[PDB]
Each structure stands twice: as C-alpha cells, then as structure tokens.
Design a protein around this ligand. Structure first.
Ligand code: 7Q1
Ligand code: ZN
Length: 258
C-alpha cells in the first residue's frame, strides 16, 4: 500500500485498495449544527487522563503519533455515548498548508486549521487489533485547532518535531500530559463512523468537541516543517494530511448540549 495525500495516491484513489472507502459509515463528515439534535440521554463524558503514560513520538509518513502505554487502564475515556471503558493508545493531528484548511471534520462547512485525534480502544476486545474489527471498537476524541494564542500544553510536542522530521523517525516522549491539549468545555457532537485513513475501518464512535483549542501560528508552522518522505529522499512537506468530508448517509449526529 502506497496511500497518501497527493494527486496520485490521495483520498480519491483510496477506494481501489480499500473499497470500504465508499461504505455506509465513513468519516470524517460535515457537522451541520442546525440538524444535529440534542440528546438528553447522553450520559456525562469522562476523560480520566491523570495516570497517562506517554512513551514515544513517531513520524509514520502520514502524521506524527504520540504513543501511550495502554497495557493497563491508565488513561481512559468513558461515558457520553460510550458503553464501557476505552483506553488511550495514541494521539495525532491532521493539518493544512494554510490556516484555512486542515481539519477532517467540518462545522457548517467551516474548516479549522487542524484537528487532534485522541484514539482509544474498547477494553472488552482485549487489544487494538481486535477492537478495530468491531463496530464499537474505538472511540476517537476529536478537537479542532484554530490559530490564535499559543497552547502552552502543546509546546513540548512542537519542540520535539525537529528530531522526527522524516518518515520512520521516532523519539522518546515520556511524561507528556494530554490534559494540556483539551479545551475548557467537554460539550460534543457524536456519530458512528470510521478511521479517516486506510484501512478505513468502520469501527469508531466519534466524539467531536464543540470548543476548539487555540494554537499559535508559530506552533502550526512547525507542524508544516515535517516531512512525508524518509531521510535522504526528495523533500515533500507534511501538509494537507486530511481526508475531506464523506457522505453522511443514514446517520444522525447527536449533540450533548442545548
Ligand atoms: O481518525 C483517524 N485518524 C487516523 O489517522 C485514522 C487511524 C488509523 C489507524 C489507527 C488509528 C487511527 O483514523
Ligand atoms: Zn486522525
């Protein structure tokens, strides 16, 4: 598989290796705020990140992943639309070449500069590989980034990026507190969807926060200095690593708020 984000290998081509690309519950989607319905029975959302153990940061040629120790219930998501306990495994971002694009989800067709995905898996399936084969296997917490004031809790990430410029490079990344990347409010929209990259598996409960975080232009500029290529290959800047909105089909987006 040689998928990516270019004219020759980007989202319009994915379907040929991964036919689920045209399936019934693909992500991302546009969130139409006037059509999403408040659902009073959503239970409160529980983000329990106090014992998180970050380990490593990896440029995988598509994004950079901050990986966690998920061998125990250290950092978990519960409540909201979720049944049971979902364990944090990694977070990453999608971003643009310019501040007017980058996010995968859209809000009333608005694109944000970037979007953070905190990926968790349902502990009742035992491991991540099993969980992605189930319709309720994953819960992805999505957080929009807008350009404004700097996010202090992001800066440790931004400063390590020079050490993982190219595909396949990793760095030790211990003691990073993902609580520093959250907005104040946990108001969200939720809907059933998919992974936004190959293999495009229809295994995700999406939880998208309404309130964006603000990052500085300098912060996002540093994201854009990464490379999709490996070391010693032609430089291709890691920008516009986002999949556009997919058809909603037979789905309803629920709001946790009035
Ligand atoms: O929402 C997603 N962002 C992605 O990069 C993709 C994904 C692929 C593989 C593992 C976890 C998530 O799905
Ligand atoms: Zn993602």
């Amino acid at each position: 598989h040689h998928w990516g984000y270019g004219k020759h290998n980007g989202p319009e081509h994915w379907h040929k290796d991964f036919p689920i690309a045209k399936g019934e519950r693909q992500s991302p989607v546009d969130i139409d705020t006037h059509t999403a319905k408040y659902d009073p029975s959503l239970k409160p959302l529980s983000v329990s990140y106090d014992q998180a153990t970050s380990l490593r940061i990896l440029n995988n040629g598509h994004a950079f992943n901050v990986e966690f120790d998920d061998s125990q219930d250290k950092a978990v998501l519960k409540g909201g639309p979720l049944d049971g306990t979902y364990r944090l495994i990694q977070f990453h971002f999608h971003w643009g070449s310019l501040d007017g694009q980058g996010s995968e989800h859209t809000v009333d067709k608005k694109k944000y500069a970037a979007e953070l995905h905190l990926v968790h898996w349902n502990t009742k399936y035992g491991d991540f590989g099993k969980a992605v084969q189930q319709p309720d296997g994953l819960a992805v917490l999505g957080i929009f980034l807008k350009v404004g004031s700097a996010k202090p809790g992001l800066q440790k990430v931004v400063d390590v990026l020079d050490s993982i410029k190219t595909k396949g490079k990793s760095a030790d990344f211990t003691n990073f507190d993902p609580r520093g990347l959250l907005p104040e409010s946990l108001d969200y929209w939720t809907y059933p969807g998919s992974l936004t990259t190959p293999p495009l598996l229809e295994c995700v409960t999406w939880i998208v926060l309404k309130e964006p975080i603000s990052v500085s232009s300098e912060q996002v500029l540093k994201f854009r200095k990464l490379n999709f290529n490996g070391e010693g290959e032609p430089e291709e800047l890691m920008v516009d690593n986002w999949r556009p909105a997919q058809p909603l089909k037979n789905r309803q987006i629920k709001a946790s708020f009035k």
